[PDB]
Amino acid sequence: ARGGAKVVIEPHRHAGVYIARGKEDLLVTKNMAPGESVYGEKRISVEEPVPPTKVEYRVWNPFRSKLAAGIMGGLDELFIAPGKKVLYLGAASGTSVSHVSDVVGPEGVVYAVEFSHRPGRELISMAKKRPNIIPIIEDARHPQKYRMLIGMVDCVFADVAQPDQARIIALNSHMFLKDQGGVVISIKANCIDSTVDAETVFAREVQKLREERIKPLEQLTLEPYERDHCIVVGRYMRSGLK
């Protein structure tokens, strides 16, 4: 926790991520560009043996991420892995897309998509320091508009706040997502529908996914971290949903 404590890193169930055991346990991803924390979080450092080097790990804050909240609540399957291609819709900045890039590692790639231009500038600077990311500063409801930059991505993550979430996911996933490909949605009930209740919103959006040919595998609510939020993991089928 503090500035000098010593912890034991350990592989989690999902590959790519790690647990730092101590008097309190910390979710951790291996830092790609070592020596600079992106959003000011503390970070662990080990030394490994030619002369040895200093490898660095980075803490994952779930009161800021909405994917480490899913990891900590416990998702059985997350389709992000140490070698894949991830399309990140709604990538505000490094505060989650950098952790996803450290998870997919130097082999895989991550295409971050944002609309507004001040988070665009943040994304451009962080992506300059980190080579797995390619940034797009364009509206995410127009895969035809950015079709020359993406080829056959392997999973999609969605942190979109707009109330057309299921249609924009369906467009991008028909265009680019591979068959039998992981879809991960973070639903915010208050953004999607404010009058009716959160459970009604959740059933409604899982219905929209099943209509747009994504078979939902599981659904977590991530309660001690955020309120009225949900994570839906599904698999893009395209052939025999039954």
Partner: protein, 50 residues
Amino acid sequence: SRVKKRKKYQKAQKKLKSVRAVYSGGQSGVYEGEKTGIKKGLTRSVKFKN
């Protein structure tokens, strides 16, 4: 009469934290960590039966 109902309500709120996982605001201090431990082998997510 309402003191019993007040004490039953707060007793039930403690039982609710024991059963479910409730929203305690968020972090306001610096994130010190999960004070109770991370588990690997458990999956508290509702699996969609087909």
